[PDB]
Amino acid sequence: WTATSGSCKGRCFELQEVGPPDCRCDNLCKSYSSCCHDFDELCLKTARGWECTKDRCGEVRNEENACHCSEDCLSRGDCCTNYQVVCKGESHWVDDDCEEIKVPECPAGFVRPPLIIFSVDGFRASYMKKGSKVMPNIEKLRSCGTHAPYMRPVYPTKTFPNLYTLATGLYPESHGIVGNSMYDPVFDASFHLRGREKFNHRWWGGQPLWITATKQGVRAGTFFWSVSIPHERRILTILQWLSLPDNERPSVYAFYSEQPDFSGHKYGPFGPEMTNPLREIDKTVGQLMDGLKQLRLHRCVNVIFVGDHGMEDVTCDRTEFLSNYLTNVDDITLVPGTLGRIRAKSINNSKYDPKTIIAALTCKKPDQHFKPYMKQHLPKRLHYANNRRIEDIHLLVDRRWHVARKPLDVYKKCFFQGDHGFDNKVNSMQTVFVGYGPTFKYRTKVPPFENIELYNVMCDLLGLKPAPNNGTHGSLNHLLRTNTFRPTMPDEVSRPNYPGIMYLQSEFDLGCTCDDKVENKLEELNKRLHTKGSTKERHLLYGRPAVLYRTSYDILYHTDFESGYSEIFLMPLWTSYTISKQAEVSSIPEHLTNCVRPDVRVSPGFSQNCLAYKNDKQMSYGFLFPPYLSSSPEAKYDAFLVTNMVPMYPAFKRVWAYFQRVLVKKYASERNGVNVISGPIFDYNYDGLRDTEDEIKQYVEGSSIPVPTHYYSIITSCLDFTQPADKCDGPLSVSSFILPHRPDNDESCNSSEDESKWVEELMKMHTARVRDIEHLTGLDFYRKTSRSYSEILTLKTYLHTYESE
Ligand SMILES: *[C@@H]1O[C@H](CO)[C@@H](O[C@@H]2O[C@H](CO)[C@@H](O[C@@H]3O[C@H](CO[C@H]4O[C@H](CO)[C@@H](O)[C@H](O[C@H]5O[C@H](CO)[C@@H](O)[C@H](O)[C@@H]5O[C@H]5O[C@H](CO)[C@@H](O)[C@H](O)[C@@H]5O)[C@@H]4O)[C@@H](O)[C@H](O[C@H]4O[C@H](CO)[C@@H](O)[C@H](O)[C@@H]4O[C@H]4O[C@H](CO)[C@@H](O)[C@H](O)[C@@H]4O)[C@@H]3O)[C@H](O)[C@H]2NC(C)=O)[C@H](O)[C@H]1NC(C)=O
Ligand SMILES: CC(=O)N(CCCCn1ccnc1)Cc1ccc(Nc2ccc(C(C)C)cc2)nc1
Ligand SMILES: [Ca+2]
Ligand SMILES: [Cl-]
Ligand SMILES: [K+]
Ligand SMILES: [Zn+2]
């Protein structure tokens, strides 16, 4: 019930929300069917339109007008945005030359430059170039301010997940808005686009920017706009709020546009119908900037022009139907479209089996346009699993396609030409970022970055301490002229042991053998030097990784590689080695094929054993530093130490062996040498965070050797590839991956072919940021470089995407 008989008289677009049954006058009351009876008349005036014309100049104020051209309008804060232009000989903001904003130029009583977030739904990154002719205001913001070529959205590349990631700095699995549609089994409640459930606060986790601001004494405009409020009214409402007295005036505001997403769905991303929507957004930007100029705020306000996701060409004829795959189609519920999520239709049906559903969906047709995954097998860069609202079974849908349950769903639910939702690495889903204002840099282009980073910067722009989130605070310092956040490196928690030779060979009873007895002060001085770290500078280029949790581990030096060996997990946490452009690949000699060697620096009790691998019929083993890359026959023996060995399913060894034998050398060739850090990851509860030992669900049979869920590598070289990786004077270049450690290659439909046809494609799909590896390992990389710490944070958030330009 709402007592709609109250009135909006002097309450139009009020900032405090009133609770039922009192009637509302705020910018969301329409959406709730709760506005006062006189809201339209009072608050949504339209008379005479939105622009001053010469004849209205100095009019007598008529309060019926949508906006005003009378002399008192600047004091009242409610002129038409073109008032000064038409009536006072002023120029439109877009016509003025740009001039650097070195310091905020604000009216008296402004405590800080306000922040205005101008968000545009469906605004694809390439519209900045392709549409540039018809967007002069947006083009001026972009060229005069700070801009990225694109900004990466979160997965799924849907509206609400992305807008709420913008507002919180959190992945969707952590903020809880994991799609535009959801079922929460604990609430037994469903969230949808249409309806009222979605307004219930229990869906919405984390702490969005408006709440962060309010808790710390910074007032916020209400960010959400009901759809029938016209854009011109939204802009005039923001500008009016900006004329409130100091004590009442918000410092942060948002505007939202349903365009260009609305028309992109109907016409496709580049339909000729798309020009008009882009012109219209531009005109809205021009209204805002003109309105700020009138208020003397155009060199005071920081403006962020930001999109949520792009738009791809997708048509009804490109739908895959689960009825072409599953016999039991009526026993499942599908969340359909540009992603798939599958769960059981009834929890009372115990003949529902996810394994047989996955199998029926796996590489069943030559051209199949979606790939099924248990959510924990999805690429870790998507961070899309650790939420009860995310169904165990997921379908990653190819760009340009939909998945649906049955054909009748597509014509009794073509009607559309664009859609979005796909993998957040897809070019068509990339969106835009421009920052313009005193706090942003002048005419500066910055590299693409991820939208989870923006919340931190929005907090910096408003002098707020960000709530805990998934941005890496400091990684976007290079966007800002001032207000940078000067992070310190985390403190190492565990210091390493440096074991010398402490064990005789016969103390080990590991069931390992090696043909290594084939056997000098010239050479013997040298090997001692190597075991004490004499080549450490060559193989450990950026310092040892810091261990940021409590653990027991040893640093182990060798000719060709250095490792941080965990006595708790019985394997290295990290292995570090450098491969020059000139390095040679060799084979594993015939006599050494099954060689494993006890490491006399590490107790038997803290070593793996070969008997466990013999007894475990499913599990084999691999090496972190690859024997193929040994610098010499004698050095090669180091690669077979039991302390360089890790458990690997045979299927995964096909992947690993190809990476180590072929690809590392290819990279050293292309990049002028590479430094590699490889190691295991254990994320059995799929939370993106390192597992403690009591979370491990699987061990090599009969032993305490834990089995990794994933293997990572960080591959660093010099950004200026004219310098070799080990003598780089400036910025670095990095690519990384987190490969899932699986007992089959069912993910790779071409896996029966030679590794050269499928392995690198797998690795590309599992590309990662150094930062993703840091969360999964509790390690901190790049601690000793000649680079600024902020620049290193940016490197650590880098994702190498493999998309074309
Ligand atoms: C991205 O950034 C985010 C934010 O920094 C990172 O997420 C954080 O990770 C922390 C570590 O996992 C986690 O800390 C836990 O918090 C528990 C208290 O949680 C409540 O309070 C906070 C603070 O306001 C609030 O934010 C939480 O909100 C969550 O929950 C509701 C849903 O219930 C949602 O509205 C919201 O969306 C959010 O959900 C997300 O997180 C939860 C987990 O909290 C997931 O279940 C969801 O899927 C969703 O992703 C909460 O309202 C606290 O109680 C925990 O402490 C337990 O564990 C420690 C171990 O050290 C132990 O000391 C304690 O005793 C306790 O154990 C007890 O519970 C156990 C499990 O139930 C049980 O086994 C034991 O026997 C004990 O009884 C813990 O400290 C923090 O909450 C989240 N924060 C957020 C916002 O998500 C995220 O990790 C980053 N991602 C990456 C990859 O880096
Ligand atoms: C009410 C409603 O349902 N919508 C969404 C329609 C989805 C349509 N759609 C479906 C498929 N494709 C497109 C409208 C909406 C959205 C955001 C918003 N304000 C806002 C501004 C800034 C921010 C961040 C940037 C801080 C967050 C929120 N006001 C209104
Ligand atoms: Ca974990
Ligand atoms: Cl969805
Ligand atoms: K075995
Ligand atoms: Zn859309």
Bridge-based pairing of strands 182-184 and 319-321 is unpaired
- The response to whether residue 174 sits with its C-beta less than 6 Å from ligand 1 reads yes
Extract the tokens encoding 162: 């992305």
CA of 265 to the centre of ligand 6 (A): 6
Extract the tokens encoding 623: 């090496």
Prior bond of 107 cis (ω within 30°): no
Between CA 141 and CA 118 the distance in angstroms is 12
Between CA 775 and CA 768 the distance in angstroms is 12
How many helices (H) and strands (E) in the chain? 23, 28
Between CA 12 and CA 236 the distance in angstroms is 12
Cβ–Cβ under 8 Å, residues 398 and 749:
no
Declared resolution, Å: 1.8
Solving technique for this entry?
X-ray
Prior bond of 260 cis (ω within 30°): yes
| Longest Cα separation, the chain | 105
Between CA 45 and CA 49 the distance in angstroms is 9
Tell which residue, 340, 345, 346, has the closest CA to residue 375. 340
CA of 593 to the centre of ligand 5 (A): 15
Cβ neighbours of residue 141 under 8 Å, at least 6 residues apart? Answer: 147, 285, 289, 303, 305, 434, 436
CA of 469 to the centre of ligand 1 (A): 12
Between CA 62 and CA 45 the distance in angstroms is 11
Taking the alpha carbons at both ends of the chain, their separation in whole angstroms is 54
Between CA 629 and CA 588 the distance in angstroms is 10
Nearest CA to ligand 2 atom 9: 159
Burial profile 377-388: b = 16 or more Cβ within 10 angstroms, e = fewer: bbbbbbbbbbbe
Extract the tokens encoding 255: 């505007």
Cβ–Cβ under 8 Å, residues 158 and 447:
no
Distance of CA 223 to the CA centre of its chain: 23
267 C-beta neighbours (distance < 10 Å), count: 19
Q: What are phi and psi of 402, to 5 degrees?
A: -120, 155
Question: Residue 115 annotated as binding?
Answer: no
Distance of CA 387 to the CA centre of its chain: 16
Please give the helix or strand (H or E) that residue 264 lies within, else none. helix 261-267
* SS3 at position 260: strand
Question: In this structure, which residues have their CB less than 5 angstroms from ion ligand 4?
Answer: 179-181
Cβ–Cβ under 8 Å, residues 514 and 595:
yes
**Angle subtended by helix axes 770-777 and 789-797, to nearest 10:** 90
Distance of CA 480 to the CA centre of its chain: 21
Q: What is the CATH number of the domain that holds 607?
A: 3.40.570.10
Between CA 464 and CA 458 the distance in angstroms is 8
Between CA 610 and CA 645 the distance in angstroms is 10
Q: Which domain holds residue 718?
A: 505-797
Extract the tokens encoding 331: 């026993």
Task: Ligand 2 pocket test: pick from 253, 256, 434 the residue with the most ligand atoms within 8 Å of its Cβ.
Answer: 256
- The response to whether residue 223 sits with its C-beta less than 6 Å from ligand 2 reads yes
Question: Residue 616 annotated as binding?
Answer: no
One-letter amino acid of 727: K
Cβ neighbours of residue 541 under 8 Å, at least 6 residues apart? Answer: 576, 578, 675, 716, 725, 726
User: DSSP assignment of 250-318, as one string?
Assistant: -SEEEEEEEEEHHHHHHH-TT-GGGHHHHHHHHHHHHHHHHHHHHTT-TTT-EEEEEES---EE--TTS
3-state secondary structure 689-751: CCCCHHHCCCECCCCCCECCCEEEEEEEEECCCCCCHHHCCCCEEEEEEEEECCCCCCCCCCC
Q: What are phi and psi of 717, to 5 degrees?
A: -150, -175
Question: Residue 168 annotated as binding?
Answer: no
Cβ–Cβ under 8 Å, residues 712 and 740:
no
In the set 159, 535, 716, 797, the catalytic residue is 159
CA of 234 to the centre of ligand 2 (A): 14
Catalytic site residue 159?
A: yes
Between CA 538 and CA 530 the distance in angstroms is 11
